[PDB]
Amino acid sequence: MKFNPFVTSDRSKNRKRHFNAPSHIRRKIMSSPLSKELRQKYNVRSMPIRKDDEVQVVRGHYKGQQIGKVVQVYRKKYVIYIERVQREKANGTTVHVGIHPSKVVITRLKLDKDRKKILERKAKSRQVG
Amino acid sequence: PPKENALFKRILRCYEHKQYRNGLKFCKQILSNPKFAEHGETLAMKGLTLNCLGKKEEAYELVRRGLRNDLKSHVCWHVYGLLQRSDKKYDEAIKCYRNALKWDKDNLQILRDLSLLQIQMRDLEGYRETRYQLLQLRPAQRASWIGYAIAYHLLEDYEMAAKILEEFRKTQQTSPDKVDYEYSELLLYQNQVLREAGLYREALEHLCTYEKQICDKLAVEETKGELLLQLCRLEDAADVYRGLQERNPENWAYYKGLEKALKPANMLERLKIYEEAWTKYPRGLVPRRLPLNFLSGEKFKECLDKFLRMNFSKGCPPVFNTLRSLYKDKEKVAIIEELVVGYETSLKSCRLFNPNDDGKEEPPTTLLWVQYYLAQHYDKIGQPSIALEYINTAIESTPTLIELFLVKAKIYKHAGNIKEAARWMDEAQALDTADRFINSKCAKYMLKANLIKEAEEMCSKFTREGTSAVENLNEMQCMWFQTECAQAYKAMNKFGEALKKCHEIERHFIEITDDQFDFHTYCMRKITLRSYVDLLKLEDVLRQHPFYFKAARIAIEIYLKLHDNPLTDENKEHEADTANMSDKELKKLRNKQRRAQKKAQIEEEKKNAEKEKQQRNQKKKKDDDDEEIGGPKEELIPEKLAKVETPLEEAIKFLTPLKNLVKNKIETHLFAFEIYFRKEKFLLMLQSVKRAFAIDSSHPWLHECMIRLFNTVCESKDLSDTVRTVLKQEMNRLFGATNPKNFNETFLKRNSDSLPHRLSAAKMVYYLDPSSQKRAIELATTLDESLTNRNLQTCMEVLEALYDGSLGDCKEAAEIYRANCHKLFPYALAFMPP
Amino acid sequence: NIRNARPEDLMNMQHCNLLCLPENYQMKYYFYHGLSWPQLSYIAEDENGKIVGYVLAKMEEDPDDVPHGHITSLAVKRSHRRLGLAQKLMDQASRAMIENFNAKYVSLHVRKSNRAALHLYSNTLNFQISEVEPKYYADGEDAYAMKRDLTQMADELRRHLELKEKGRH
Amino acid sequence: KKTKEAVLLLKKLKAWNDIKKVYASQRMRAGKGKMRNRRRIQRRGPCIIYNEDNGIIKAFRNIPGITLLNVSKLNILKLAPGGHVGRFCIWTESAFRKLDELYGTW
RNA sequence: AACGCAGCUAGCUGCGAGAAUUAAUGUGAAUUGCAGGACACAUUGAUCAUCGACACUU
RNA sequence: CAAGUCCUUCUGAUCGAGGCCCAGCCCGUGGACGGUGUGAGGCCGGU
RNA sequence: UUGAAAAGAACUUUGAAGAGAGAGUUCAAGAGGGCGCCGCCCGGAGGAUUCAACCCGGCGGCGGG
Ligand SMILES: O=P(O)(O)O[C@H]1[C@@H](OP(=O)(O)O)[C@@H](OP(=O)(O)O)[C@@H](OP(=O)(O)O)[C@@H](OP(=O)(O)O)[C@@H]1OP(=O)(O)O
> What span, in angstroms and rounded, lies between the C-alpha atoms of B571 and B493?
18
Instruction: List Cβ neighbours of D66 (8 Å cut-off, separation of 6 or more).
Output: D19, D45, D46, D47, D48, D60
Q: SS3 helix, strand, coil % of chain A, rounded to 5?
A: 30, 25, 45
Q: SS3 helix, strand, coil % of chain B, rounded to 5?
A: 75, 0, 25
Angstroms from B160 CA to nearest CA on chain C: 25
* C132 DSSP β-pair partners: C144
Give the CA D46 to C1' F2 distance in Å.
Answer: 27
> What span, in angstroms and rounded, lies between the C-alpha atoms of C67 and A42?
18
Angle of CA points B647, B650, B651, to nearest 5°: 85
Helix axes B217-230, B181-196, angle to 10 degrees: 20
- CA B77 vs. chain centroid, Å, equals 39
Amino acid symbol at B43: L
* C111 DSSP β-pair partners: C143
Find and give the residue nearest to F5, measured CA to C1'.
A58
Instruction: List Cβ neighbours of B589 (8 Å cut-off, separation of 6 or more).
Output: B581
Angstroms from B18 CA to nearest CA on chain A: 9
List the end-to-end C-alpha distance of chain A, in Å, as a whole number. Answer: 22
B-chain residues near A66 (CB < 8 A): 17
Instruction: List Cβ neighbours of D13 (8 Å cut-off, separation of 6 or more).
Output: D90
Angle of CA points B254, B256, B262, to nearest 5°: 100
> What span, in angstroms and rounded, lies between the C-alpha atoms of D54 and D59?
10
A-chain residues near B18 (CB < 8 A): 65
Amino acid symbol at B437: F
Q: Could you check: is the Cβ of residue B601 within 7 Å of any atom of nucleic acid strand G?
A: no
Residue A3: what are its φ and ψ, rounded to 5°?
-110, -10
* C146 DSSP β-pair partners: C108, C129
Find which of C19, C55, C111, C158 to mutate to test the B interface (most B CBs within 10 Å of its CB): C19
Find which of A11, A14, A15 to mutate to test the D interface (most D CBs within 10 Å of its CB): A11
Count CB-CB contacts under 10 A for residue B263.
Answer: 10
DSSP of B556-597, one letter per residue? HHHHHHHHHS----SSHHHHHHTTTS-HHHHHHHHHHHHHHH
The CB-side HSE value for B642 (13 A sphere, CA atoms) comes to 14
Minimum CA–C1' distance nucleotide for D58: F29
Rg value, chain B, Cα: 34
> What span, in angstroms and rounded, lies between the C-alpha atoms of B518 and B813?
61
Instruction: Return the ligand 1 atom nearest residue B409 CA.
Output: 11
- CA B548 vs. chain centroid, Å, equals 4
Which of these, B534, B539, B429, B447, lies nearest to B488 by C-alpha position?
B447
Q: Please, is C35 exposed, middle or buried when counting C-beta atoms within 10 Å of its C-beta (0-12, 13-18, 19+)?
A: buried
Give the CA D70 to C1' F34 distance in Å.
Answer: 34
Amino acid symbol at B560: L
DSSP of B613-633, one letter per residue? HHHHHHHHHHTSSTT--S-PP
Count CB-CB contacts under 10 A for residue A65.
Answer: 11
Q: Could you check: is the Cβ of residue A77 within 7 Å of any atom of nucleic acid strand G?
A: yes
Bases of chain G below 7 A from a protein C-beta are 4-11, 24-27, 49-50
Greatest C-alpha distance within chain D: 51
- Let me know: does B664 contact B696? Beta carbons within 8 Å: no
Q: How far is the CA of B287 from the centre of ligand 1 (A)?
A: 27
The CB-side HSE value for B559 (13 A sphere, CA atoms) comes to 31
Q: Which residues of C80-112 are buried (b: 16+ CB within 10 A; e: fewer)?
A: bbebbbbebbbbbbbbbbbbbbebebbbbbbbe
User: Which residue of chain C has the CA closest to B250?
Assistant: C1
Amino acid symbol at B810: C
Instruction: List Cβ neighbours of B341 (8 Å cut-off, separation of 6 or more).
Output: B374
Which of these, B159, B156, B216, B208, lies nearest to B186 by C-alpha position?
B216
Method: cryo-EM
Residue closest by Cα to atom 35 of ligand 1: B413
Count CB-CB contacts under 10 A for residue B142.
Answer: 17
Angstroms from B774 CA to nearest CA on chain C: 43
- Let me know: does B46 contact B31? Beta carbons within 8 Å: yes
- Cα–Cα distances (Å) from B322 to B283, B391, C49, C92, in that order, read 16, 20, 12, 22
Residue A48: what are its φ and ψ, rounded to 5°?
-60, 145
Q: Could you check: is the Cβ of residue A129 within 7 Å of any atom of nucleic acid strand F?
A: yes
Q: Which chains does D contact via 3+ CB–CB distances below 8 A?
A: A
> What span, in angstroms and rounded, lies between the C-alpha atoms of C51 and A6?
69
- Let me know: does B187 contact B213? Beta carbons within 8 Å: yes
Residue closest by Cα to atom 6 of ligand 1: B410
Please list every protein residue whose CB sits less than 6 Å from any atom of ligand 1: B 413-414, 480; C 48, 50
**DSSP letter (8 states) at residue C121:** I
Instruction: Return the ligand 1 atom nearest residue B414 CA.
Output: 3
The CB-side HSE value for B15 (13 A sphere, CA atoms) comes to 23
Residue closest by Cα to atom 5 of ligand 1: B410
Instruction: List Cβ neighbours of B553 (8 Å cut-off, separation of 6 or more).
Output: B667, B671
Q: Could you check: is the Cβ of residue A28 within 7 Å of any atom of nucleic acid strand E?
A: no
> What span, in angstroms and rounded, lies between the C-alpha atoms of B472 and C22?
13
Q: Please, is B617 exposed, middle or buried when counting C-beta atoms within 10 Å of its C-beta (0-12, 13-18, 19+)?
A: exposed
Residue A24: what are its φ and ψ, rounded to 5°?
-65, -35
Count CB-CB contacts under 10 A for residue B604.
Answer: 9
**Collapsed DSSP state (helix, strand, coil) of residue B225:** helix
Chains A and B touch (3+ CB pairs under 8 A): yes
Residue closest by Cα to atom 15 of ligand 1: C50
Minimum CA–C1' distance nucleotide for A23: E48
* D27 DSSP β-pair partners: D41
> What span, in angstroms and rounded, lies between the C-alpha atoms of A116 and A110?
9
Pairing of strands D67-70, D47-50: parallel
- Let me know: does B499 contact B555? Beta carbons within 8 Å: yes
- Let me know: does B24 contact B49? Beta carbons within 8 Å: yes
> What span, in angstroms and rounded, lies between the C-alpha atoms of B145 and B524?
10
Q: Please, is B593 exposed, middle or buried when counting C-beta atoms within 10 Å of its C-beta (0-12, 13-18, 19+)?
A: exposed
Which of these, B358, B355, B369, lies nearest to B313 by C-alpha position?
B369
Which of these, C37, C116, C25, lies nearest to C76 by C-alpha position?
C116
Which helix (H) or strand (E) segment holds residue C114: the answer is none
Q: Is B620 on the interface with A (CB under 8 A)?
A: no
Count CB-CB contacts under 10 A for residue B27.
Answer: 25
Residue closest by Cα to atom 26 of ligand 1: B480
Contact: D39, A11; criterion CB under 8 Å? yes
Q: Which residues of B471-490 are buried (b: 16+ CB within 10 A; e: fewer)?
A: ebbbebbbbbbbbbbbbbbb
Which of these, A102, A74, A109, A69, lies nearest to A85 by C-alpha position?
A69
Instruction: List Cβ neighbours of B27 (8 Å cut-off, separation of 6 or more).
Output: B7, B11, B42, B45, B46, B49
- CA B473 vs. chain centroid, Å, equals 16
Residue A79: what are its φ and ψ, rounded to 5°?
-135, 160
Residue A97: what are its φ and ψ, rounded to 5°?
-115, 125
Which of these, B268, B276, B265, B267, lies nearest to B254 by C-alpha position?
B276
Bases of chain E below 7 A from a protein C-beta are 26-33, 40-42, 45, 47-49
Long-range CB contacts (within 8 A, 24+) of A83-88? A85/A57
Greatest C-alpha distance within chain A: 57
Chains B and C touch (3+ CB pairs under 8 A): yes
A-chain residues near B19 (CB < 8 A): 64
Long-range CB contacts (within 8 A, 24+) of B242-245? B243/C164, B244/B218, B245/B277
Which of A 48-67 have CB under 7 A of nucleic chain E? 48-51
DSSP of B529-541, one letter per residue? HHHHHHHHHHHTT
Minimum CA–C1' distance nucleotide for A92: G10
Q: Which residues of A92-118 are buried (b: 16+ CB within 10 A; e: fewer)?
A: eeeebeebebeebbbbbbbeeeeeeeb
Instruction: List Cβ neighbours of B548 (8 Å cut-off, separation of 6 or more).
Output: B505, B509, B657, B658, B662
DSSP of B48-82, one letter per residue? HHHHTTT-HHHHHHHHHHHHHH-SS-HHHHHHHHH
Which helix (H) or strand (E) segment holds residue C70: the answer is strand C68-76
**Collapsed DSSP state (helix, strand, coil) of residue B471:** helix
Residue closest by Cα to atom 36 of ligand 1: B448
> What span, in angstroms and rounded, lies between the C-alpha atoms of B561 and B767?
18
Instruction: Return the ligand 1 atom nearest residue B550 CA.
Output: 29
- Which stretches within chain C are classed as H helix? 12-20, 28-36, 85-101, 115-119, 151-168
- Cα–Cα distances (Å) from B128 to B132, B151, B157, B490, B580, in that order, read 6, 5, 12, 48, 74
Angle of CA points B205, B211, B215, to nearest 5°: 145
- Which stretches within B248-329 are classed as H helix? 252-262, 267-280, 289-294, 297-314, 319-322
**Quick one: resolution in A?**
2.7
Q: Could you check: is the Cβ of residue A103 within 7 Å of any atom of nucleic acid strand E?
A: no
- Let me know: does B764 contact B784? Beta carbons within 8 Å: no
> What span, in angstroms and rounded, lies between the C-alpha atoms of B753 and B757?
8
**Collapsed DSSP state (helix, strand, coil) of residue B318:** coil
**Collapsed DSSP state (helix, strand, coil) of residue A63:** coil
> What span, in angstroms and rounded, lies between the C-alpha atoms of B150 and B152?
5
Count CB-CB contacts under 10 A for residue B636.
Answer: 17
Strand ranges of the sheet holding A79-82, from the earlier edge strand across to the other edge: A79-82, A68-74, A54-57, A104-108
Instruction: List Cβ neighbours of C40 (8 Å cut-off, separation of 6 or more).
Output: C33, C57, C58, C59, C69, C93, C96, C97, C100
Give the CA B523 to C1' G51 distance in Å.
Answer: 79
Q: How far is the CA of B410 from the centre of ligand 1 (A)?
A: 10
* C75 DSSP β-pair partners: C54
Helix axes B792-804, B755-768, angle to 10 degrees: 10
Return residues 8-27 of A near B (CB < 8 Å). Answer: none
Which of these, C79, C81, C67, C85, lies nearest to C151 by C-alpha position?
C67
- Cα–Cα distances (Å) from B72 to A19, A82, B81, B342, B758, in that order, read 59, 40, 15, 89, 72
Count CB-CB contacts under 10 A for residue A128.
Answer: 5
Q: Which residues of B285-319 are buried (b: 16+ CB within 10 A; e: fewer)?
A: bbbbbbbbeebeeeebeebbbebbbebbeebbbbb
> What span, in angstroms and rounded, lies between the C-alpha atoms of C144 and C137?
11
- Cα–Cα distances (Å) from B717 to B14, B106, B711, B720, C118, in that order, read 70, 63, 12, 8, 75
> What span, in angstroms and rounded, lies between the C-alpha atoms of A117 and A96?
32
DSSP of A3-17, one letter per residue? --TTS---HHHHHHH
